[PDB]
Amino acid sequence: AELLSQQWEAGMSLLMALVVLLIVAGNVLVIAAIGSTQRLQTLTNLFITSLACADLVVGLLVVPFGATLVVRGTWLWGSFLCELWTSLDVLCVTASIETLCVIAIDRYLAITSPFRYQSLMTRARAKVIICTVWAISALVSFLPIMMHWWRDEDPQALKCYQDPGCCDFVTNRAYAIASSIISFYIPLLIMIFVALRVYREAKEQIRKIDRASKRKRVMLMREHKALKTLGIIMGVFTLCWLPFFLVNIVNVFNRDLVPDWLFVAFNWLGYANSAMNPIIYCRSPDFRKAFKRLLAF
Numbered sequence: 083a084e085l086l087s088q089q090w091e092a093g094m095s096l097l098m099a100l101v102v103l104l105i106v107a108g109n110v111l112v113i114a115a116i117g118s119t120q121r122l123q124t125l126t127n128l129f130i131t132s133l134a135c136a137d138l139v140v141g142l143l144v145v146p147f148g149a150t151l152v153v154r155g156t157w158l159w160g161s162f163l164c165e166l167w168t169s170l171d172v173l174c175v176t177a178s179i180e181t182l183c184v185i186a187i188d189r190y191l192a193i194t195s196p197f198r199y200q201s202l203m204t205r206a207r208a209k210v211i212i213c214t215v216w217a218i219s220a221l222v223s224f225l226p227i228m229m230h231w232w233r234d235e236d237p238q239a240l241k242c243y244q245d246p247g248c249c250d251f252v253t254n255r256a257y258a259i260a261s262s263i264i265s266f267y268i269p270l271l272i273m274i275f276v277a278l279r280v281y282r283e284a285k286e287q288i289r290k291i292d293r294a295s296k297r298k299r300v301m302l303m304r305e306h307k308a309l310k311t312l313g314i315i316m317g318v319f320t321l322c323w324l325p326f327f328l329v330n331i332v333n334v335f336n337r338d339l340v341p342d343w344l345f346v347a348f349n350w351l352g353y354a355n356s357a358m359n360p361i362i363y364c365r366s367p368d369f370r371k372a373f374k375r376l377l378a379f
């Protein structure tokens with residue numbers, strides 16, 4: 083037995099150590115591929131950078147510690163770092179879904195009103211939107227956790243708060259529902275609604291083609307190119323997290339209905355999404371050229 087443990091430990095410390103690499107590496111790749119490639123410095127890729135820092139923090143901070151928790155069974159870093167870890171964990175997920183939301187709206191405006199967009203949206207502004215998207219996210223994730231709004235009266239929760247070795251995120255039903263709606267479900271329904279519109283209008287444009295000029299076109303042509311890449315990016319994020327949050331809502335009405343491992347599974351599917359973006363950006367010939375550039379092929 084005491085050996086069958088040892089296998090699973092170092093065996094799992096291998097996957098954990100691996101995903102960290104695939105996450106950090108992949109995203110640092112994406113941040114450099116924009117930070118040093120003239121044609122990959124669109125406005126949209128400023129958000130993609132933002133999006134890639136959320137994922138980057140996930141790989142340096144969220145997972146490492148979350149690793150040492152699945153593997154070693156307990157929490158080893160004290161009751162404070164438990165809160166901070168949980169906050170950073172919640173922050174990144176909200177900040178992601180929020181940037182993915184902006185990115186959706188952003189395209190919609192640039193596709194339907196390619197104009198008011200071009201004059202209104204400046205790089206200096208886009209940063210203010212990124213800052214605003216983090217500022218909100220921070221506020222919704224960190225503060226309520228800091229103020230213990232999440233805690234339960236239940237003896238389960240109560241005992242887990244007492245123990246500096248428990249770092250289960252046992253949350254009262256209210257925080258569950260409220261925080262999952264604010265941080266996830268609304269942003270997601272907005273993003274899906276906007277994304278279906280951006281898809282429909284994108285179709286009507288190609289349906290009504292070479293009816294526009296070469297000037298009215300070589301500026302639409304450019305913004306359409308990369309839509310599908312983004313539509314994937316969104317569609318994956320949705321599938322990677324919807325289960326975790328579907329299960330979270332289910333767990334409110336009916337604790338002891340969906341197995342605790344399936345819960346932790348899904349949360350890990352969620353962290354997995356942080357390493358899927360760069361792989362998906364390899365659709366783009368420019369990113370691919372930039373990744374080879376950086377790896378020194």
Ligand SMILES: CCCCCCCCCC(=O)N(CCO)C[C@@H](O)[C@@H](O)[C@@H](O)[C@@H](O)CO
Nearest residue numbers: 222226230231234235254255256257260261
């Ligand atoms: C952006 C975050 C969204 C806000 C979520 C926090 C609100 C939680 C409500 C509150 O103020 N509580 C006490 C504050 O400590 C929690 C209690 O409501 C809770 O203990 C129970 O009454 C029910 O939740 C039953 O599960």
Ligand SMILES: CCCCCCCCCC(=O)N(CCO)C[C@@H](O)[C@@H](O)[C@@H](O)[C@@H](O)CO
Nearest residue numbers: 189277280281284306307308309310312313
């Ligand atoms: C972001 C919200 C979701 C945006 C969805 C974008 C769909 C636009 C239509 C589309 O992607 N194609 C037309 C057939 O449906 C295929 C090709 O256009 C594509 O492979 C590339 O060539 C790029 O032009 C991407 O538009």
Ligand SMILES: CC(C)NC[C@H](O)COc1cccc2[nH]c3ccccc3c12
Nearest residue numbers: 168171172175176251253258261262265
């Ligand atoms: C068990 C903890 C450490 N894992 C948290 C997940 O990574 C992400 O969970 C969330 C992300 C964003 C908003 C959230 N609201 C929640 C309410 C209850 C449970 C998780 C979340 C949650």
Ligand code: NA
Nearest residue numbers: 161245246248
């Ligand atoms: Na604790």
